[PDB]
Symmetry: D2
Subunit: 491 residues, 4 copies
Amino acid sequence: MIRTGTQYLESLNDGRNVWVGNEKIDNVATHPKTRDYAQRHADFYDLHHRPDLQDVMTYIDEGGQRRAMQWFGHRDKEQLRRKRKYHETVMREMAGASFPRTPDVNNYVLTTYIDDPAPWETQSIGDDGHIKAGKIVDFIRYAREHDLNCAPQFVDPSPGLRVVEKNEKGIVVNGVKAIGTGVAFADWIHIGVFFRPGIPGDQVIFAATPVNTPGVTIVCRESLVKDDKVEHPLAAQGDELDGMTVFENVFIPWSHVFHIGNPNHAKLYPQRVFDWLHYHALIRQMVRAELVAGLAVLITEHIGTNKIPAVQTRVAKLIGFHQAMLAHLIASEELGFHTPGGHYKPNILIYDFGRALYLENFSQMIYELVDLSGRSALIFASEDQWNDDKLNGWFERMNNGPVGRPHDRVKIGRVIRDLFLTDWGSRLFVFENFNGTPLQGIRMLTMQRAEFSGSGPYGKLARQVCGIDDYAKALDAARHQEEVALAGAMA
Amino acid sequence: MIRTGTQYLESLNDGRNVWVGNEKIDNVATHPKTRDYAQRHADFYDLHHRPDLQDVMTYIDEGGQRRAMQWFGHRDKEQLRRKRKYHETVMREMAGASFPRTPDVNNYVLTTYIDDPAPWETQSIGDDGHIKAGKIVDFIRYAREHDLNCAPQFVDPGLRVVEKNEKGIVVNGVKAIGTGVAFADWIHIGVFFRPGIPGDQVIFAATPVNTPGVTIVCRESLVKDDKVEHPLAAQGDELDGMTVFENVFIPWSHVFHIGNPNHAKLYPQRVFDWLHYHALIRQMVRAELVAGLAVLITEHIGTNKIPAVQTRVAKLIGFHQAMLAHLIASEELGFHTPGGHYKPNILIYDFGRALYLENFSQMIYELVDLSGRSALIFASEDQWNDDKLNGWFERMNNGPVGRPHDRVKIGRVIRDLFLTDWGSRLFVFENFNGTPLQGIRMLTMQRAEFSGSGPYGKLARQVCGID
Amino acid sequence: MIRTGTQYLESLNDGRNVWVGNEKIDNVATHPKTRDYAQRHADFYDLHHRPDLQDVMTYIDEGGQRRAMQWFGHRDKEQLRRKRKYHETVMREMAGASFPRTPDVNNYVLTTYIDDPAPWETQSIGDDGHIKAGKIVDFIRYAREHDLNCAPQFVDPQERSPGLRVVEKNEKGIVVNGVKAIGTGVAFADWIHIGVFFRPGIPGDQVIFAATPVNTPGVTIVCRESLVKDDKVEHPLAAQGDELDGMTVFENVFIPWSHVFHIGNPNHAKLYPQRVFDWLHYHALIRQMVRAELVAGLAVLITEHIGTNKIPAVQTRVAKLIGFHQAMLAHLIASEELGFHTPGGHYKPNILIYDFGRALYLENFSQMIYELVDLSGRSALIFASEDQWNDDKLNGWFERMNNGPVGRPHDRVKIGRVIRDLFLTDWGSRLFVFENFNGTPLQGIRMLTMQRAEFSGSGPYGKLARQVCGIDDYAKALDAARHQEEVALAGAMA
Amino acid sequence: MIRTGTQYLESLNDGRNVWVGNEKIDNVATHPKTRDYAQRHADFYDLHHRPDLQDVMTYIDEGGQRRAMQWFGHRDKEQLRRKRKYHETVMREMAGASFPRTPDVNNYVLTTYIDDPAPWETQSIGDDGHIKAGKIVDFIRYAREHDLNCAPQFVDPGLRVVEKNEKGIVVNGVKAIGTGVAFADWIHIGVFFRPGIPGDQVIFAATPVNTPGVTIVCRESLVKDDKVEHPLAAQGDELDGMTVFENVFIPWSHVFHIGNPNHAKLYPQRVFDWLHYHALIRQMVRAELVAGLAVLITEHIGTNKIPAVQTRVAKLIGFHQAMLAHLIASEELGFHTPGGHYKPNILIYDFGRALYLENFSQMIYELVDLSGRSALIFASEDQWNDDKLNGWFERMNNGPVGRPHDRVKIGRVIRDLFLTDWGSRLFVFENFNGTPLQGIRMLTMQRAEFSGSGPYGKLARQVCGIDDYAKALDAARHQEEVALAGAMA
């Protein structure tokens, strides 16, 4: 049976040590500061029990068990599209993709271990042979069974998390994981790291631990949730907190340790892990661009500016941005490739270039919407003002346009305001540069590779115009994923 | 005399009808949603009593009385620059130009009536002789005498004249745009001509904020509760809103002009010119603040040495220098008005406004992106000082310069300015601090001195061999 | 057979009346201002005979005959990709896509007539029943058989317009008089393919679709000066010849009814000519992807050759030229994936996605080329001429000035020559300016899209916003040209 | 008298060794590939003799001698404005700023030596005291008295001193970048500091263009033949190239400084200041020409009342006014140099340039786009006049303003300026007419006064609740500091 929201809310009250701003949180499910977002997670779970969404939200596995599509492994392009349609439906249903780290996103990442668990073991160092690939798989199967949200914590800002003790039982780790999103709302924390030049071996740690593990403290920014859901129909729905996690002599048994000790392993295997979350981000970006275009269509129509040609071309601009996101996503899916375990993975270069295009232009596109909406964005009637005997008539006449009731202008502006002109909405704006690797990151790590050099495919045409000049074979399986993706793109 | 902050606050308790969101405000000076910004207006009066600021904030008038620099008329360039320096000083003292309709701005606008009152009287249609130019002047003099905040409401079911008699006029309708009217003394009514406007909707007058029939209807307050976490946004929200006039009575003495669509083409723009020149002063100071925060935050993190960040920060500095170039060339290439006031060059300060409104939003994104994680995710104060968390926070916020807590200091200011409702409003307001970006271009281009017969044509015509 | 470049060149000496600048052209095949681009068309034909390119360049039609792929009709996505593959090969082989209006592009557009010929005839007004659908298809079979180049002239700038109009109708034909103001390569084509787009108020006598030979009496082709360069060592691309642009003047030109495809109906001229030019737009996107590939390629080569390629600030600029090419690719591949069938069963790529692909290029290419020019530094402007490079005193200086980590020093000149021709000569500038006329421009893409109901709050983009704000088969359609647009959007949004 | 164009052309025939592309040049003054640009130099000199312009173009010194304004020392703001009006008049008179390195620009830069000669001498290393400040000044006085064009070559196989004796130095190597050198009288040798620059490459000097062992190697000439079809590009091409120095001897009298990498840090910036000011004067005029061409073409077609068109033209007009604001503000907030010259605010005109360099591409692209098909496809003159075509071209080119042929006139100038090789060189060269966008930003930000302890720090720190050339050890460093203080108060 698939986890219910009610079971989720209950599980949160587990003694987890959480700060939200200045306050200590006794129960994340009920504290006024967290409880709207927690309920968003509960609704996530209850979407898997909605009769009308069953086709999209669930699957029957080979054992005959109905399971949430968040665990669904895709081995070809048609299966990939079915998964995307799941993620898309989840975010469309949940305030138009305002919650980017629902558990379906968080858990997508575990697909990499399952696909190819052995290198995580075999490349481990400092280990005394205790880590086992089979136990990595066992943990993921356990998560899937209980529908557990495993919040990933990989990025670092010497306070980084490190091994301070090793015995026959497991490891002790001490330090800080600087970035985490929604961890106070998860069941487990998924610890990882990305390579940086000179990363010490005792900082190379991949593992999992419960959110209430003793010595774990979750320190989150203040909550931006709004009280009044009528003035703030989106920002009153909860705030997906970001924060840091402190680990004070936290013990992790070897069974839940995936890898330690190998800096070269940290060069490409973590990228492979975060690939799934990057692909998810582009789906999200597409949906956000559709929402932004759509709001410009609704507001310019209700104001009556829609038929002004100047405005027509700017709206067409917002629609084109959405189509660019869809073109990268679709193309990424068409030109995917099989991973060593035989999952099908969309093309990494195309969907990351999708992301870079979004991260580059989304500011100006939002600014366009805000500007198109004039005063209707910020200065509109509160509800009581609108329904007041003396004010109502004035408000009706100042918001009359061609298409529909005058109050629909207020309804539109409340959304534009919540998404783009509140702290809550601004958090989303900013998070986008932290939802996987930033713009500058995509471009840097792509351009360091030998297949984007004059020797590579991009040099070939320019060379002639100028008159110049299988994982069995491949020795690095996760490097091969990068090369095979350019193969597919440039053919 | 010179009004104090205390007298100001007291004056707000006058039975004015104000909505802020759903709430009715009993008293704008003490209500939890309005009192912080009220206090900012109080700070503004008290500024003119600060002994170190007296040379900058006040002049001696012809009569011998010390007057607030908001009432000073600049008759040449150096006087203009004295006034700018006053406006600049006010906004630098008051939260880095975070409050754009302080009383010095609102009242700047009255220069146009004083400079040349007559045409407002003589161009009136349908007043049967009741409106008197000298009465316009006496009102402004009155306003001067008591340091009264006349809040302008021009931009537009709009307000119309429903009854004329021998005592005054009666007005009924809405003035849909107004900023900080709940904090002002008087409302200054005006209008801009639009194609096929009627004589009964052309109205310039002044009326008290608590005039019977007047209802100020303001958006919810965005003021923050906790000044430590939010050092700027706790300081008060300059409310925007509309004003409803339910058959409101204004005497002829306090009516400046009625009835003439033609007058509403040119003369209201001459009123708002002062607001636009002030707009660029402010935009320069916002640009300077943004550049300074990019330097502080790149220097605290230690990314300021990375050549890619250098060029990004230089660009912010350059934008400030572009605001300054426009402001300075506008003052340099100004001209005398009919009554012999010196006015900055309309064309140059407005292209200056155009440039800000076209680029501000990418310049802010640049500060936000440079600041990285330090804008959304930083320690609250209690987190910071917690005996368990203090040592981790200090280690994470360490870098070359200063003390680790300065990061949070800088972070709170960036957050408040650009990542709060409160800050976002100042963002949206710039598109409504006078005429919007598309309007500057359009009102410039509809005049024939930017046509091919104008000065822009001349070099092009010579190079082309044209006539 | 398949026509040969020799056959083509011989065919140009047919007495056509051609101005190229101040000069009259006796013979396009041999005149100094035209002969190089003529030979580029000769090379196009010969490319089809190259044994190593037979599978790319040719097919066997139903009736057992080997024809050039320019005539191939693609009925599914995999056949579509074969057609794209052919257009890519042609443009890669011909100076990195510097000749945008080769015959394969011009004739691609005839597919719309073959697909669904009847409406051209049934929607005609004022022809007194003389026009037959069958005859459009017959002309096209005739063009195909002789591999004839049909250059399209549709685009235009009341009783004062100079645009082509019908001034006589009789039992034999029509007589047209006036101007088709834009034309690319017409002086080098076999036939002029005449069309028009709807404009508000267009009179019926200016709605014309037809074909006449380029040497028809009364036809004059008036082209801009030729920008071809004399020295092909200093200018290895712009010595290859100049695809002339120009207008065509028609003075009482007789066209027989057999060669008239449609007259009279302004409503027909609004979507049907968009359906003809969809094929040209799709091809424009294929070219746009290759041009981007070249721009990014040149940028890699020059930054590597100078050694600036490792500077991080430079790296991010080249990544962005690389992402642009990938943006073009993505639109192209997506458009192929979400394509649809036309009435007559052709597979067409998704109109909306490839047009948005073009808008993205048209909006950004200018900045992108500026990047390349800026990254290449002084190597664009100042480099050695060939004799300078080989001079006994200068050579030692030039080698030491042009050294760096990759290749031979003279390769910087080789790269410089290409950047200079492509982006810093008259010849390259025309191509730059032509990108905005190679199909309805950026402004047109956005306006034609937004006038349609499916981009209103009533169509698919309204739906998610309305829910978040808490608000609230060609047989069965009447206009088949319209329904292509509705089907394209449904496939894009589902 | 002031030099005449005639005397200048005669002077070109001095046996200088010039490549233009593959050809050697017998006489820059008469060769088809260079004679038109040479005549534009001759025209520069003849402007100074025109009686309707000599109040702008010349001044009387206190000896009663009429001198070309290119030599005029400005000591205050009004005098700087007269100099600027002169440079402006020159470039409006010569094909709308299409000739960026006329002699007035080249020679402006000598102002710095004259202002403060002595550090060039005193900070020299390895010259055994042979360099004398008095001889630096005498050279500039000579240049001035004969109205000689000293073309600067500074930016970098580099030129190195290979021999030092009692008469002078011998230099060997390449000065990679040079504009118009083949049309000049003297070459002004310079260098900018770069990390690890050896003393033997620190050289400031003057040598005649025809000096033995100098070869001028220029790119091919971009000049067009038909001045009807090409009214600007027919007027000559301002060649770019490198200058090869083969064991070239320079007398100590014409050496200004050698040896000191420290001197190369800021003093070269101080020389180029003046050219950078001039670049912004030129950028304003190019902006003006671009904006007016926009007004002319949209007007002649009729697109000028389409509101979307109007806003784009307003943007070109804004860009012009932005260059003018920086220009005016630089002049307003200027300062005196050690020698008493008044110099515009270095930071403000350099930011003006930055602004231009960042945006000119897009602004020119707007004009080309707005100009439509009228850019590329328009009638040649014989087409236009032909008896059969005339009627068609007139009707196609009718609109609300002026004669139909005026669209061809506007087209020809837009074509020359932005769609030919010739115009394209002017496009690319913008980025070389002084330190490029990247350089302005980078050497600004390495200066301590743009840090958090300088005036940008002040407002930020407060809102965040945080916390005379005699005194100065470096006169050329002091100018920068003074420039910022004047801009920020």
